């Protein structure tokens, strides 16, 4: 990175750390949350690279950065998943019609059951790529799944413990 | 599916009760502001007859009464015009 | 009604005070200053696709499809 | 010999949903709406489904759209009258078949709350009750009384439109009783996880859910309580909060939880 | 309608697939960007705009008050409307 | 009773003092066009007929009769309110596509929310950018009167 | 083989309280202020 700044092993592990938390913190399934933070967490995370890239060997910064890394790897992976299943039910809405009614209702899925089929895959893929991230996988993609299987019924492995 | 008590209509018809009568005095008040500025910059003034009053208009702003084209816009209303206007 | 000066500075102040006062009330304090949030995230927010049709790809791709890129 | 239009949809036929009108004697009913869906049952359309339980009000299966408002059949009264009495669903629900609604978001948010007692310290050996006082203990007083009806949920204007995002009256109601509940140790924890823009702050007041509780809780008050308390006590340092217990429900199962 | 069954999700954060999340963070940076644009307009009124009544005034501050520090004699009655 | 409208004294002058024919610029042009129409429930405010009357006339630029600087002075304060105009429809037609493209994958509710509110802040915005442009802001008091000056009065007899 | 029913919008048939008309009265506060002006500046600029 292009910088002048300069800064102590101590203040590289602090912005790291807070950076850290202020990521595994935030509500990813709130959608505007993700894409007004991620931007910040950009900048921040260029930053905070340049300044602990000594430290990376460091083993009190380098675990952090590493940790760092997976939760931002998650963070864009589960949010993936959902921005498709957020598609799916805005097309199963506007399938619906106006005031419910069907009178201007758009097309509806036709390869609902085969789309639902994908996204569990993907869930299942997220679980294992990222193991000690389950909890946000579950606020996400794993919520995200429950709201499908309302419309179609479809089988997860996690459908009992969703109440379905 | 339709009902009178529905939040739809009872929320409809609360939002007229509500807005209507401050609209119309908050667009009447406009009006009123407009008026005032009108009366002052050009009242209108009632003349009996028409053709005596644009003998005396002609007369007093030395204007030639051939080239003034008159004419009817409303019952009530007439207009001289120049007839030479490019 | 000649008076050698005139004091403007304590009525010139409260105007300013008062004019500065309810446009930063207005601007600042109200929770209805946020009501062009409400409004988008309970109605707007999380309602996208991008595999249904819209006019605005519609025109633009058309367009395009006319001119040969 | 009231008239009851009853909304009905099968699951299998997959057919628009149908209002099918039935007349009833109630010189020969209960006077309860759940008696007269149980006699049309019993005598003129066995296939209409319904939950039903109690009886009495208490378990909170029952909960249903009767004449617009949302009720609990079984402590709604029949109003006889020229108008027939219109029975549907709860509303803005997935109907699973006539009157039975589909309420698996509403359990599955509730778990998300963790509504289960949480302390620093485990129970010493040889330790009796945690000392609670009658004050502390009526502060828990109408919010302990929910039976899960879903009424409030499905009369939330807010909740109709952004299901998925916001908790629900009684979800929310549900939160304030454990960050009010003396005993519990992680009062920061929760009111951190709950200060979100959609969970939380999506409530503009309809005050639907106060009116319809069959109850007789006030979700509405409790929420408002809930906002002015997190807008006091909020720190900086909440969000890292948040991602510390976050990580320590690591290896929770796979289920809604606090992260 | 019908939607692709053969899409490859994002991975990790640098081997990402375009998404409407993405899209929705171009918005908010063309979005902001106008709001800065839009500054120029609030901004070149009150730098540009004069509030005098004729081209008098400065004529009088040239010939009879260059300084900003002639006195003028108070005729309340003039500004007063009585 | 019966009213009659008549040519207002400015116009008198002008008439008297026109020495030929003005070219009418193309932004001219287009501001008038572009001018929305005026009902005259009541006569008080000049409209794009008017207007046009004003601009058309041609004055010498060199004349130091002080009647004939009056017209000239209104003229450029009648001239810069028209070129004004051109601003509208560029702010509306932006004020809406920009809005429209942005929110073209999101559902019908938020375009009818949206779209209303941009497009009049947009016309409200090009309409600053054009009197700001063209000069309004800094006329004088006695710019901004000669120019907003009636061109036809209610007759007043005696 | 089984699927589930959408049921339509609430708010045509939903009962009303006043405390959700009234609500609704103050969300909408802003959106008549706007009118309002659009109005004068149409009236201003299209009669008298
Ligand atoms: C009539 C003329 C106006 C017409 C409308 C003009 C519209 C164009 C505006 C252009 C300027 C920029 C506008 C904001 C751009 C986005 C900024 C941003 O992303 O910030 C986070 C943004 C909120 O920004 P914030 O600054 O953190 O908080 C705002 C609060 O005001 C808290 O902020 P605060 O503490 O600084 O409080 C100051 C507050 C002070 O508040 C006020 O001035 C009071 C009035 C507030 C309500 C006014 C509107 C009422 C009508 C209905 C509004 C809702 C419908 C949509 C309206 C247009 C929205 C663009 O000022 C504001 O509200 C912020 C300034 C910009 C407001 C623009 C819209 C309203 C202009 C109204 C002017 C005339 C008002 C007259 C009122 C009547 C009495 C005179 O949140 C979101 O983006 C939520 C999105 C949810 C849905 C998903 C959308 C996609 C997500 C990806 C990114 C999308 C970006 C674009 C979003 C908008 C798309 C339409
Ligand atoms: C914030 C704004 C504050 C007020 C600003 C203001 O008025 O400044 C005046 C101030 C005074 O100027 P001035 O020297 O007196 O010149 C007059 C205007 O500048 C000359 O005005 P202009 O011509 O430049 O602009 C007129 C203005 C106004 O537009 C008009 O004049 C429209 C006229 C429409 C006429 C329609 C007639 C329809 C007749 C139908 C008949 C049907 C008959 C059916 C019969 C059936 C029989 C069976 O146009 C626009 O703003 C653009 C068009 C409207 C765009 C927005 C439309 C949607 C608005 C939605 C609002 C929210 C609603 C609720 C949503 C939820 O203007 C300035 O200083 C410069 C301009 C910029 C001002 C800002
Ligand atoms: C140190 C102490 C500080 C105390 C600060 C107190 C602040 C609060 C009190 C208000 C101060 C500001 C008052 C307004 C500005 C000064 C007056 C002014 O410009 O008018 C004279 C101008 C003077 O113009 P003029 O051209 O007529 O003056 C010539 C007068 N003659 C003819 C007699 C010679 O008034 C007008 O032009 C007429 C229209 C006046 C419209 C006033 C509208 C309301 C203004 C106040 C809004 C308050 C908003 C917030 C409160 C809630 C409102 C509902
Ligand atoms: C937000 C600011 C918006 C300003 C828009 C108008 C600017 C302008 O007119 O500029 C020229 C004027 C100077 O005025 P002027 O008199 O030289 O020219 C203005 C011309 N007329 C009068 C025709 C309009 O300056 C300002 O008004 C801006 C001053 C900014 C001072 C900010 C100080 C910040 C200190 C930070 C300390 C941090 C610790
Ligand atoms: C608080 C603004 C923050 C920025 C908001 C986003 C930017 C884009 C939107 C515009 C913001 C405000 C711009 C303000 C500057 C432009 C004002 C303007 O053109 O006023 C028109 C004009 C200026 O008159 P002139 O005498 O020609 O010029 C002044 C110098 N002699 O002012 C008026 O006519 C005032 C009308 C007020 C009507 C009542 C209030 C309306 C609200
Ligand atoms: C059934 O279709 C509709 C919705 O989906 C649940 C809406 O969100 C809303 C609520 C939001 C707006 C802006 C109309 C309504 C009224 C609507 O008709
Ligand atoms: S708050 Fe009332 S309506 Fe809601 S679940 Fe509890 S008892 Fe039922
Ligand atoms: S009706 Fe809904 S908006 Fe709040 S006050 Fe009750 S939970
Ligand atoms: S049957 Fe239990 S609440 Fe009615
Ligand atoms: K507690």
């Known amino acids: 990175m292009l910088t002048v700044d300069k800064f102590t092993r101590a203040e590289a592990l602090q912005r790291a750390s807070n950076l850290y938390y202020q990521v595994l913190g935030t509500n990813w399934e709130d959608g505007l949350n993700l894409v007004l933070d991620v931007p910040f967490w950009e900048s921040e995370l260029e930053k905070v690279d340049h300044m602990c890239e000594p430290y990376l060997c460091d083993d009190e910064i380098g675990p952090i950065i590493r940790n760092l890394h997976e939760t931002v790897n998650c963070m864009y992976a589960c949010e993936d998943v959902r921005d498709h299943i957020n598609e799916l039910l805005e097309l199963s809405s506007r399938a619906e019609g106006v005031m419910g009614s069907g009178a201007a209702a758009s097309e509806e899925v036709e390869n609902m059951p085969e789309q639902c089929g994908m996204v569990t895959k993907a869930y299942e893929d997220l679980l294992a790529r990222y193991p000690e991230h389950h909890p946000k996988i579950e606020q996400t993609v794993g919520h995200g799944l429950a709201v499908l299987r309302q419309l179609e019924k479809f089988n997860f492995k996690s459908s009992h413990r969703y109440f379905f | 599916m339709l009902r009178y008590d529905s939040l739809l209509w009872q929320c409809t018809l609360a939002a007229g009760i509500w807005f209507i009568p401050q609209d119309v005095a908050a667009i009447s008040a406009f009006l009123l502001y407009g008026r005032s500025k009108s009366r002052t910059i050009n009242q209108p003034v009632y003349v009996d007859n028409i053709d005596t009053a644009a003998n005396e208009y002609f007369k007093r702003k030395g204007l030639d009464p051939t080239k003034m084209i008159m004419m009817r816009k409303s019952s009530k209303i007439t207009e001289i015009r120049y007839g030479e206007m490019y | 009604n000649k008076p050698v000066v005139v004091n403007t500075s304590g009525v010139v102040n409260t105007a300013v005070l008062g004019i500065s006062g309810a446009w930063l009330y207005f601007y600042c304090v109200p929770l209805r200053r946020k009501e062009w949030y409400d409004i988008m995230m309970d109605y707007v927010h999380h309602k996208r696709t991008q595999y249904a049709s819209n006019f605005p790809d519609k025109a633009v791709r058309t367009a395009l499809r006319f001119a040969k890129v | 010999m009231q008239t009851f239009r009853v909304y009905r949809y099968d699951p299998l036929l997959q057919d628009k949903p149908h209002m099918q009108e039935f007349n009833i004697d109630l010189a020969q009913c209960g006077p309860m709406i759940l008696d007269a869906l149980i006699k049309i049952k019993a005598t003129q359309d066995s296939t209409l489904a319904f939950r039903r339980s109690c009886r009495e009000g208490i378990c909170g299966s029952c909960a249903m759209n009767i004449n617009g408002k949302n009720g609990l059949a079984c402590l709604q009264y029949i109003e006889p009258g020229a108008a027939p009495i219109d029975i549907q669903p709860l509303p803005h629900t997935y109907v699973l078949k006539d009157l039975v609604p589909d309420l698996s978001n509403f359990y599955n948010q509730y778990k998300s709350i963790e509504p289960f007692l949480k302390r620093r310290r485990a129970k010493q050996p040889g330790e009796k009750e945690y000392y609670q006082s009658i004050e502390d203990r009526e502060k828990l007083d109408g919010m302990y009384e929910c039976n899960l009806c879903a009424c409030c949920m499905t009369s939330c204007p807010s909740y109709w439109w952004n299901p998925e995002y916001y908790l629900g009256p009684a979800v929310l109601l549900q939160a304030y009783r454990w960050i009010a509940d003396s005993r519990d140790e992680f009062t920061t924890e929760r009111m951190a996880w709950i200060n979100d823009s959609m969970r939380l702050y999506r409530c503009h007041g309809i005050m639907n859910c106060t009116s319809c509780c069959p109850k007789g809780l006030d979700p509405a008050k409790a929420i408002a309580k809930m906002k002015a308390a997190i807008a006091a006590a909020y720190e900086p340092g909440w969000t890292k909060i948040v991602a510390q217990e976050s990580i320590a429900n690591k290896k929770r199962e796979s289920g809604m939880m606090y992260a | ?82 | 009773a019966n009213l009659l409208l008549v040519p207002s004294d400015i116009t008198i002058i002008e008439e008297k003092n026109k020495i030929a024919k003005r070219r009418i610029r193309l932004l001219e042009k287009t501001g008038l066009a572009l001018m929305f129409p005026v009902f005259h429930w009541r006569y008080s405010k000049l409209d794009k007929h008017d207007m046009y009357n004003i601009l058309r006339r041609k004055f010498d630029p060199s004349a130091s009769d002080p009647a004939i600087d009056i017209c000239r002075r209104r003229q450029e304060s009648v001239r810069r309110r028209v070129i004004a105009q051109n601003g509208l429809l560029p702010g509306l037609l932006l004020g809406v596509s920009l809005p429209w493209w942005s929110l073209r994958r999101y559902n019908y509710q938020s375009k009818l929310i949206v779209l209303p509110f941009c497009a009049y802040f947009g016309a409200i915005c090009g309409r600053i950018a054009g009197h700001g442009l063209s000069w309004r802001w800094v006329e004088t008091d006695r710019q901004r009167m000669l120019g907003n000056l009636p061109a036809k009065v209610y007759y007043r007899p005696k | 083989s089984y699927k589930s029913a959408h049921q339509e919008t609430p708010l045509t048939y939903y009962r009303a309280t006043q405390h959700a008309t009234s609500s609704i009265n103050h969300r909408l506060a802003y959106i008549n202020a706007v009118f309002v002006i659009w109005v004068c500046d149409s009236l201003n600029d299209v009669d008298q």
């Open chain 5, 1 to 82: 309608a019908r939607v692709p069954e053969d899409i490859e999700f994002t991975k990790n954060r640098y081997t990402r697939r375009y998404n409407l999340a993405t899209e929705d963070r171009v918005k908010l940076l063309n979005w902001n960007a106008f709001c800065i644009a839009v500054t120029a307009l609030p901004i070149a009124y009150v730098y540009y705009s004069w509030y005098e009544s004729s081209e008098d005034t400065d004529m009088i501050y040239r010939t009879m008050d260059p300084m900003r520090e002639a006195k003028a004699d108070y005729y309340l009655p003039l500004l007063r409307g009585h």
